[PDB]
Amino acid sequence: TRLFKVTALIPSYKKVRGGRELQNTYFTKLVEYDRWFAEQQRIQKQGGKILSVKMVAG
Amino acid sequence: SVVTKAIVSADAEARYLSPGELDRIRGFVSSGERRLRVAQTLTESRERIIKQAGDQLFQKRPDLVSPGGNAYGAERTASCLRDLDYYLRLVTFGIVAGDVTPIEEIGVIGVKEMYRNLEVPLPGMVEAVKAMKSVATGLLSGDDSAEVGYYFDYLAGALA
Amino acid sequence: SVVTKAIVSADAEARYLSPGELDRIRGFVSSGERRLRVAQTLTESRERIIKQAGDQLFQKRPDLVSPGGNAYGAERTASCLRDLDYYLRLVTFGIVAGDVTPIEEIGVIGVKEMYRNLEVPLPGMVEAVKAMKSVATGLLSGDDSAEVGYYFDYLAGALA
Amino acid sequence: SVVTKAIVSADAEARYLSPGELDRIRGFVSSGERRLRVAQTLTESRERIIKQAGDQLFQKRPDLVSPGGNAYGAERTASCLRDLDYYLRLVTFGIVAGDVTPIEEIGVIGVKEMYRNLEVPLPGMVEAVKAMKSVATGLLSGDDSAEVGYYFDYLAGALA
Amino acid sequence: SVVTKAIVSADAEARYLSPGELDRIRGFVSSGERRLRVAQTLTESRERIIKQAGDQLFQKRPDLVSPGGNAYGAERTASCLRDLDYYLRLVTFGIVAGDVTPIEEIGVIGVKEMYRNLEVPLPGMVEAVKAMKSVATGLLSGDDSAEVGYYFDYLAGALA
Amino acid sequence: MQDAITSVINTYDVQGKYFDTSAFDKLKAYYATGELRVRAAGTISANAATIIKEASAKLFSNQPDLVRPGGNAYTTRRYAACVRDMDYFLRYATYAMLAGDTSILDERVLNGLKETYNSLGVPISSTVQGIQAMKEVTGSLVGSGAAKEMGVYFDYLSSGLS
Amino acid sequence: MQDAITSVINTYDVQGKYFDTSAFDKLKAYYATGELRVRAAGTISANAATIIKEASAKLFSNQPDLVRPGGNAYTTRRYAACVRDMDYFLRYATYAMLAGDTSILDERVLNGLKETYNSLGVPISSTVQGIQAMKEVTGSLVGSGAAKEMGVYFDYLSSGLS
Amino acid sequence: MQDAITSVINTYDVQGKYFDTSAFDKLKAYYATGELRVRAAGTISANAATIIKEASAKLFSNQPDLVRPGGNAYTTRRYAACVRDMDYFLRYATYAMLAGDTSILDERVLNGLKETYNSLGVPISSTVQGIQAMKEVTGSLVGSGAAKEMGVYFDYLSSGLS
Amino acid sequence: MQDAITSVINTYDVQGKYFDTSAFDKLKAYYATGELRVRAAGTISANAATIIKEASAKLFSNQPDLVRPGGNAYTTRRYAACVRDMDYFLRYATYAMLAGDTSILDERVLNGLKETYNSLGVPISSTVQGIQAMKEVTGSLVGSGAAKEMGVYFDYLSSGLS
Amino acid sequence: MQDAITSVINTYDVQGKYFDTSAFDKLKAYYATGELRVRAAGTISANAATIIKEASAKLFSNQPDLVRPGGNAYTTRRYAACVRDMDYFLRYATYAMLAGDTSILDERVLNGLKETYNSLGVPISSTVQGIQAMKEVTGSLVGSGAAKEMGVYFDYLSSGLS
Amino acid sequence: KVIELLTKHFLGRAPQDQAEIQRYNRILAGKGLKVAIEEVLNSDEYTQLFGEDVVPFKRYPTLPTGTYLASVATNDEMIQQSGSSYSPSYAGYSYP
Amino acid sequence: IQKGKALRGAEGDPYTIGTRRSPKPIFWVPQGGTNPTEFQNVIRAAYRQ
Ligand SMILES: CCC1=C(C)/C(=C/C2=NC(=C\c3[nH]c(/C=C4\NC(=O)[C@H](C)[C@H]4CC)c(C)c3CCC(=O)O)/C(CCC(=O)O)=C2C)NC1=O
Ligand SMILES: CCC1=C(C)/C(=C/C2=NC(=C\c3[nH]c(/C=C4\NC(=O)[C@H](C)[C@H]4CC)c(C)c3CCC(=O)O)/C(CCC(=O)O)=C2C)NC1=O
Ligand SMILES: CCC1=C(C)/C(=C/C2=NC(=C\c3[nH]c(/C=C4\NC(=O)[C@H](C)[C@H]4CC)c(C)c3CCC(=O)O)/C(CCC(=O)O)=C2C)NC1=O
Ligand SMILES: CCC1=C(C)/C(=C/C2=NC(=C\c3[nH]c(/C=C4\NC(=O)[C@H](C)[C@H]4CC)c(C)c3CCC(=O)O)/C(CCC(=O)O)=C2C)NC1=O
Ligand SMILES: CCC1=C(C)/C(=C/C2=NC(=C\c3[nH]c(/C=C4\NC(=O)[C@H](C)[C@H]4CC)c(C)c3CCC(=O)O)/C(CCC(=O)O)=C2C)NC1=O
Ligand SMILES: CCC1=C(C)/C(=C/C2=NC(=C\c3[nH]c(/C=C4\NC(=O)[C@H](C)[C@H]4CC)c(C)c3CCC(=O)O)/C(CCC(=O)O)=C2C)NC1=O
Ligand SMILES: CCC1=C(C)/C(=C/C2=NC(=C\c3[nH]c(/C=C4\NC(=O)[C@H](C)[C@H]4CC)c(C)c3CCC(=O)O)/C(CCC(=O)O)=C2C)NC1=O
Ligand SMILES: CCC1=C(C)/C(=C/C2=NC(=C\c3[nH]c(/C=C4\NC(=O)[C@H](C)[C@H]4CC)c(C)c3CCC(=O)O)/C(CCC(=O)O)=C2C)NC1=O
């Protein structure tokens, strides 16, 4: 179809990181359709939780 | 656990478990009873293991409980023995799980930064863990002693 | 400003500011009164600077105020002088800031597209900036005109 | 050094150095003589600084030179003192450089792994460089002492 | 050309050319005789087109050929006419190729940088190209006039 | 991801106690069911293509408008998406059954899937019917003792998507 | 991010006005406080590890439940994350103190921190008390004059969380 | 995106139907306007910079305080962003005119534009006036029929802003 | 890259020595020339476009065969790439002059440049002519004392290319 | 990578042959030593930090110039990289010992190691001496039966580097 | 060569091993450039080095073997190809 | 003093040689407020990479 607006939080479980990475933990971005399955699956496999999924266009 | 790691690895390639992982889980669950027996023997031996390990540690490293030491004082020695108790519980968890994943996740990720903030000497960690290994290995049979020593060696390597 | 650049540089590496950065900021704050006096001198005589600089600009390029020129007329010449005033204000801001970031952010990013959409010749801007540089450095002493010249040269190069 | 930092920053952005960067370089080269005499003063008194800093280190921390301490014995104590001498030399290099870059890249990057492989306590490093700070800022005047103490504080923070 | 565009688009997708691309190529190659007729006509009238376009450019802008102009003198005016000849040749190349890609990547990419380095005013180029458009489209028939006009519009817009 | 063993471990870790008789009993229960779980997972892995074959066949026979023009599963693309989702449900249900815990369904299936289906308009009822079809096909092959266990995780997925 | 000087520049830019006596007075005030700010920043940078040690010790003595099992700081990973966050607050408060504004605190620290802690389960009130502990430790260190300057940005962080 | 042909194809594909007489009539109507649309698009492309310059001059002459200090278009950065947005609107109106459909506007310009401009402080009324100025200039250049076709998409942009 | 100061630091570090009277002499020599170098760098940065204009004009006047059809400077793209390379050389020469050392030249410009040009078809003799022309153009503006130092780095580039 | 089992498999697969009695004999020979290999690997993992510490100490004692100023292992940077490389050698030798084959050493350690160190300036003979140091330290801890097995892989690394 | 340029530009790296070449060659033969780009950018290595907010940069990884030297040669290598297929230049002098 | 003496002489390894380093300035776009010049810097860095 078209774009998604996805909000997900990815915590850190393998290490404690020294940079800030607030933006790498909580983030809202636009993910268009043919990549959303892969992106959702990667977020799930990273241990992160998906907070909201919205259909912006389509 | 063994099952958790096998499932994560299978899900990494987005595939069902291969005969290797299935036979791995089979061999893991076939040995569960002796793992539980070992974890018991560690569990009811609470004070003997912890106090003997702490005594041997303070004998080999008197500086820790000497004045100016990190563990000097009654409350600080209590904290030292409490850390040892923590790690013995983690070792029993790793025994039942079949891997070091409980030990790793609860006490290894970030332990260096934790003990740096606490000005705790990591060589003291390693010597205490070696003491715990000696005492816990003494209470078990040879086949179980080797396996338990493997987990204690993992903990010592993580601290060192 | 200088402080912002130092802080952003330190933050990119997730570190506190080093003695070199602190020394840079110390030298910046120690020189604050001098650049403040320079900026006050420039702003207190801004009308003279703008009028004279417009005079040299129109002498060098009479075609700008000639028929068919972009500055022909009272209102268009007024717009030209007002642009000169804008850039004089930006130069004073840069003086107080210690670097060309105010100039870069208010008058340079996207200036080519601006003056293209307005049919304003860029070499005309460069020579107008040069005229302001000459007139403004006339008012200051040699030492102050020294640093003011670098800001004006940066502006000229940015337009060019 | 300061010049290297400014040039590298200007190069990563593919631009000429800004007026502020040229100003910081001007200030750095203008203050070269004072920092140069500071390095001269610290260099003339190497032996006294190292001897006194070692004395205060070993009095504050008897366990380092006690049996079982890392610096126990004459030769290990000499290795201790020559590490301190290394760091005093790096501090002089940093003073002439105008930044802590020589210290950062000769005796900081990988210092944790190096001293972990050597069973050298990082806290011991910290009070050692603090003692060397005290001795070295004793010989200098107030402004020179503060300028040198900034470098010693940076080193102590790096070892911590 | 059209064929190269279709092939690189297909190659970026690791596929053979789709029926739409093959139809586009078919339509392009069916019109080749018309394109070659137009290009040959523009080639025959090369000197006339350049002469009238240069005359129209110069009669609007006498300053360019007056003392102090960019194209002042026989040699610089010859360079002017030579550039007009370059661009007419590029338009013929674009007509035979069926796209402005030869025009683009022989005389558009970096054209502003080149003419800025040469201190050649871009509005002069735009007006000269418009004059060349008028003269050239006068010679061709209406259907060919529109096609030639598209390429001249592309050139004039790209120079602007 | 946590299995039964990890579930007990975390339960005792958040309390700071050692393993008691209850913990050892749960561990023994999981170890006892481990062989059956491995056999069931192997059988399911063997027949996954056939299971999805038959489950999608029954789902599209029961709701023919799903695959006919105007249906949510009407195109080669959307039909492929449907059967792909069914594949992923089957494999993750097998993972959950082999683990002895329903967590992996939470963080690796239901983690944002309901929102995605709602955004796209995927019929939740038809998805539940397809999951029930996979349940029916799987239980026929694996065996009743393990069919009951697979039913738990299939029902978990159906409830979560609901 | 913004400094005091940049803030004055922007205020007089949106008005299209040259600097006047008030702007020059504000710039002089910042220049006068500059050397004090640099001394405080150097003192804090030298003693960042010590400040974090003392503040975290005070916080975990006031609230020991955070580090016993069940507390949000009970694991080596979670304790390390907590002291790491304390490092963040100290370093960014030092940046803000040098800058003379709290813009960096909004842009680079407090931008989505509250909901991040909410989803993670971090106790915001306990984190605020940790920031308060850092404020007390740092004030005991830099001196009476710079203590209020540092406490301004520490209080800004605390109010941003709460 | 979809054009008129793709819109008809989508309609008859969701209906599951072959092309009918009305579909062929719509296709004939779109094909009959192809040359007019191509000529208008070429004229607009050849004159886009002139249209933007004239429209921006009209907009800033009617509302001088947009680009004076304190206006939303006051800086070279802001002025550049403004004229770039005007180029975007003109180019996308030309695309939509060629396609015979307003979709590309919806999914590539108007989606979120009202929210973006409200969050930034961009005046919607002045943006609408700039779009209408481009409409007037473009209609003067392209001729009556082409202006009638282009006005649909210019009005669509202005209405989707509000 | 390394400057003069870091070059002295290197020479004394590889020997494990504190600074000697000769080291302090070299550091004095560098500090003495600092204001000259800063003034020269400011002058060059002010007139970079002008310097490149004269250098390119001289190079293309002496070698009109570069800009004739079929030369390596014949297209707008390749003319632009040529003046871009001249910008590279001027800027990096200014860097090296500020550093007082030629290390940045070796690491960032000359490394692999000869083979890169040979693969591109760029004439190296003509590039050396352009660099020399830029040297005479720059030396007039910087002044004799600065010209003697700047010619060192220009000749370093020319020798590295040769 | 290849181990003894995979080496036998590949040897018979290149011929398109089923396993014969010689292959089964080789597989039995590997399965007989598997337990000794696992015990030695666990012993190495237990003492890896120690082995590296004494080996590096003895190496830098025999070759003091390596860590004195001007040495290749003289900076915390280069010293840390040196002991890191010895850790790499120990880990990969343990891998090769566990696999029963030196293929992993060839294709993950020795492939391009010589010219890597040559580009770096790392003294290869000193690296060989450090590898010998690790072998000498390891043989005492593992025991003679395991010492010979670990020594064949240490000697493989030493001969490949020499 | 396209695979090596992909790794250079978006991982700051040379190709690690032959398996990477095989995977990306299969992707380039089947699907094209876009899918190879998304494979490089959706990799775990990319998200661990640059995450979501860091511009990729040149790296010289210590592991695996040969990757450091290859990455030095890669990140050092400048563009060697003419920027256009139109109007080639030639070696040759015109004597005045 | 004896324990700190250089043994390879002036033909020793300075810190500059050894392994190659990544660019020390790391470019990133922070979530939240961003200065215009720093944004242009990051964009130019991305195009350059
Ligand atoms: C520079 C701006 C910035 C901030 C402020 C920041 C905070 C921050 N803390 C986090 C986790 C955490 N933070 C804490 C700290 C809490 N635990 C105790 O109760 C205390 C009350 C309190 C600290 C004083 C803990 C325990 C976690 C781990 C949560 C988990 O993984 O379950 C995380 C999630 C990523 C990770 O786990 O590493 C972020 C983003 N990150 C940033 O980039
Ligand atoms: C389950 C994972 C886990 C661990 C392991 C853990 C350890 C831990 N030990 C602590 C204190 C301590 N731990 C020690 C132990 C050291 N003293 C000597 O040096 C010995 C070498 C050594 C013990 C073998 C001491 C002395 C303290 C008190 C520190 C102080 O009061 O300043 C603290 C700070 C809070 C408290 O007082 O309890 C933690 C977090 N926390 C965890 O969540
Ligand atoms: C220029 C950067 C640099 C540094 C700093 C450096 C330090 C360094 N110190 C060493 C030994 C040592 N270093 C120390 C110092 C410790 N003793 C006490 O515990 C104190 C906490 C502390 C001194 C304040 C000691 C005792 C040894 C001897 C270790 C041994 O022989 O077992 C070694 C081992 C090699 C050798 O002895 O030649 C190195 C490389 N090397 C470098 O390239
Ligand atoms: C095929 C792509 C291509 C183009 C287009 C091109 C143009 C070009 N024109 C040049 C000079 C020139 N070009 C012009 C033309 C300008 N004078 C007036 O202002 C007019 C507005 C305008 C003509 C309509 C003039 C007068 C010169 C001579 C400048 C001088 O000698 O000082 C030069 C410098 C070298 C030379 O003298 O031949 C180039 C490279 N070169 C190329 O490789
Ligand atoms: C591993 C966990 C997981 C799953 C399962 C998952 C499913 C999923 N299904 C999707 C679309 C879809 N899913 C379906 C399947 C549904 N429609 C049919 O009628 C059935 C009732 C039903 C399946 C039984 C269809 C038809 C689409 C296409 C929707 C569209 O394109 O409009 C999408 C959107 C992206 C894409 O299709 O590439 C996702 C992410 N995502 C995940 O992270
Ligand atoms: C602070 C950043 C900033 C700048 C610089 C800026 C310039 C600017 N100058 C303008 C007009 C103008 N500007 C000029 C000046 C030119 N005339 C000659 O050619 C000279 C070369 C040159 C002046 C030295 C002229 C003639 C106009 C009127 C053009 C017209 O009427 O269309 C306009 C259009 C609206 C208006 O009249 O105010 C802008 C936005 N705006 C900004 O926000
Ligand atoms: C698993 C196979 C493998 C190996 C072994 C390997 C070694 C290796 N060593 C390197 C640098 C180095 N290697 C050493 C090694 C020491 N120099 C001393 O003189 C000793 C003789 C010697 C070790 C006993 C040193 C000093 C450096 C330079 C580190 C630096 O410049 O910071 C590098 C350059 C990249 C980096 O260090 O991050 C590599 C790739 N890489 C591999 O993929
Ligand atoms: C900062 C270090 C650095 C240098 C030195 C450098 C040179 C360089 N010049 C190039 C192209 C070029 N360079 C030139 C310049 C030559 N042509 C003329 O005849 C002159 C004799 C001469 C210049 C005075 C030209 C014409 C090209 C275009 C080649 C082509 O596109 O085929 C290229 C290929 C990619 C490109 O930029 O287009 C490089 C890498 N790049 C760098 O990153």
CB crowding D17-29: b at 16 or more within 10 Å, else e: bbbbbbbbbbbbb
CA of E131 to the centre of ligand 4 (A): 17
Query: Which residue is listed with tokens 């996954």?
Result: F48
CA angle I123, I125, I127 (to 5 degrees): 70
C-beta separation of D86 from D26 below 8 A: no
C-beta separation of G1 from G107 below 8 A: yes
Residues with CB under 6 A from ligand 8: I 66, 72-73, 78, 81-82, 85-86, 88, 108-109, 113, 116, 120, 122-123, 126-127, 130; K 78-79, 82-83
A 10 A CB-CB count for H52 gives 22
**Segments in K1-96 forming alpha helices (H):** 2-11, 18-30, 33-41, 44-49, 67-76
- Which amino acid residue places its CA nearest to atom 6 of ligand 4? E83
Report d(CA J47, CA K58) in Å as an integer: 36
- Which amino acid residue places its CA nearest to atom 5 of ligand 2? B83
CB-nearest partner of I119 from K80, K84, K91: K80
E160/H45 Cβ within 8 A: no
Give all strands of the β-sheet with A26-31 in edge-to-edge order: A26-31, A4-9, A49-54
CA of I9 to the centre of ligand 2 (A): 44
A 10 A CB-CB count for L21 gives 12
- H or E element: which one contains I99? helix I76-99
CB-nearest partner of J53 from D105, D107, D117: D117
Q: How far apart are the first and last CA of chain L?
A: 48
Question: What's phi and psi for H33, nearest 5 deg?
Answer: -95, 5
Residues of B in contact with J49 (CB under 8 A): 157, 160
Query: Which residue is listed with tokens 């890609």?
Result: E101
CA of F81 to the centre of ligand 5 (A): 5
Q: Which residues contact I67 (CB under 8 A, 6 or more apart)?
A: I60, I73, I74, I79
Structural method: cryo-EM
Six token digits for residue J14: 């290149």
Which ligand 8 atom minimizes the distance to the CA of K81? 32
Identify the sign of the CA torsion B85, B91, B92, B94.
Answer: positive
Greatest alpha-carbon span in chain D: 59
Chains that touch J (3 or more CB pairs under 8 A): B, D, I, K, L
Residue type, B101: T
Q: What is the DSSP letter of K54?
A: B
CB-nearest partner of B117 from G53, G77, G78: G53
C-beta separation of H156 from H113 below 8 A: no
H/E/C letters for each residue in chain D? CHHHHHHHHHHHCCCCCCHHHHHHHHHHHHCHHHHHHHHHHHHHCHHHHHHHHHHHHHHHCHHHHCCCCCCCCHHHHHHHHHHHHHHHHHHHHHHHHCCCHHHHHHHCCCHHHHHHHCCCCHHHHHHHHHHHHHHHHHHCCHHHHHHHHHHHHHHHHHHC
Chain L interface disruption, residue of I9, I13, I14, most L CBs within 10 A: I14
Q: Which of residues 97-156 of G touch C (CB under 8 A)?
A: 98-100, 104, 108
| Touch between chain B and chain E: 3 or more Cβ pairs under 8 Å | no
Residue closest to B94 by CA, chosen among B25, B41, B39: B39
Six token digits for residue A58: 């389509």
Residue L31, chain A, CB below 8 Å: the answer is: yes
Chain J nearest CA to L49, separation (Å): 25
Residue C2, chain D, CB below 8 Å: the answer is: yes
Question: What's phi and psi for A27, nearest 5 deg?
Answer: -160, 140
- H or E element: which one contains A26? strand A26-31
Chain A nearest CA to H161, separation (Å): 16
Residue closest to B24 by CA, chosen among B38, B10, B3: B3
CB-nearest partner of I14 from L4, L5, L10: L10
Q: Which whole-number Å values give the CA distances from K72 to B96, F51, G162, H107, K75, in the listed order?
A: 47, 51, 50, 44, 5
| Touch between chain H and chain K: 3 or more Cβ pairs under 8 Å | no
The resolution in Å comes to 2.6
Residue type, K40: V
L1/D8 Cβ within 8 A: no
Residue closest to C158 by CA, chosen among C117, C120, C105: C105
Report d(CA G155, CA G140) in Å as an integer: 16
How far does CA D108 lie from the centroid of its chain? Answer: 10
Chain I nearest CA to C157, separation (Å): 6
Segment J109-114 long-range contacts (CB within 8 Å, at least 24 positions apart): J109/J157, J109/J160, J109/K65, J110/J157, J110/J160, J110/J161, J110/K65, J111/K65, J111/K66, J112/K65, J112/K66, J112/K69, J113/J160, J113/J161, J113/K65, J114/J161
Residues of K in contact with A23 (CB under 8 A): 52-53
- The answer for B37, left when phi > 0, alpha when psi is -120 to 50, beta otherwise, is alpha
How far does CA C36 lie from the centroid of its chain? Answer: 15
Chain B nearest CA to J115, separation (Å): 33
- Which amino acid residue places its CA nearest to atom 7 of ligand 7? J85
Report d(CA D100, CA D156) in Å as an integer: 12
